């Protein structure tokens, strides 16, 4: 059911990446369905984010760990930027900074506090999106123009409403898994 929805609303490439991420962690997407959906949603948000930007953004999320760290190392060696302790989601060649993307079912400020306390690196920019059209970013610097952020918010709200139409939203939002 939730698996059916995930396979019907996300393109096969994102679904395959999410299935691979869960097989890496060791979880079955048919039991941990909310994890599955959250991972698909986060991947799709990262890909939209990087695609709205001469390519401005370098996608790090969605890569196997070897290639992710290869990309991070190459960026740090060609820019002198400090090497993050956690694999970030994108690199911004325009602002020259790593971006950690957050998609939460909780209030954006709660999840922002959580992620900022986690990464504890004053150089990784944080951008939190909610399923309610809310966002919170480091220094209120949202990076993207209004149209791209609007499209991301629209896609997230649409995912939420598609879950609600299938009676999947209550379970998904009451779970923190995937964040
Ligand atoms: O990189 C990850 O593994 C990860 N995990 C949970 C939430 C995120 O936003 C994220 O980027
Ligand atoms: Mn990530
Ligand atoms: Mn992220």
Numbering used by the authors: 0 to 52, 73 to 198
The article reads:
Among the most important influenza virus targets is the RNA-dependent RNA polymerase acidic N-terminal (PAN) endonuclease, which is a critical component of the viral replication machinery. PAN is part of a heterotrimeric RNA-dependent RNA polymerase complex, which is composed of PA, PB1, and PB2 subunits. The PA subunit, which enables endonucleolytic cleavage, is composed of a C-terminal domain that is mostly structural and an N-terminal domain that is catalytically active. In native PAN, the Mn2+ cations are coordinated by His41, Glu80, Asp108, Glu 119, and Ile120 and five water molecules, producing an octahedral coordination geometry at each metal center.
Previous work has focused on the identification of MBP fragments and their evolution into lead-like molecules by FBDD.20−22 A carboxylic acid-modified hydroxypyridinone MBP was reported to achieve IC50 values as low as ∼17 nM against PAN. As anticipated, the addition of a bromine atom to the MBIs produced no apparent change in the binding to the active site metal ions (compare structures of 1 and 2) and aided in ligand placement within the electron density map. Both compounds 1 and 2 coordinated by bridging the metal ions through the phenolate donor. Compounds 1, 2, 3, and 5 present the same triad and display similar binding poses, coordinating Mn1 through the ketone and Mn2 through the carboxylate, with the hydroxyl group bridging Mn1 and Mn2.21 The binding and inhibitory activity (vide infra) of these compounds are comparable to those of the parent MBP 1. Compounds 1 and 2 showed similar inhibition activity, indicating that the bromide did not impact metal-binding relative to the parent compound. Both compounds display high binding energy per atom (ligand efficiency, LE).
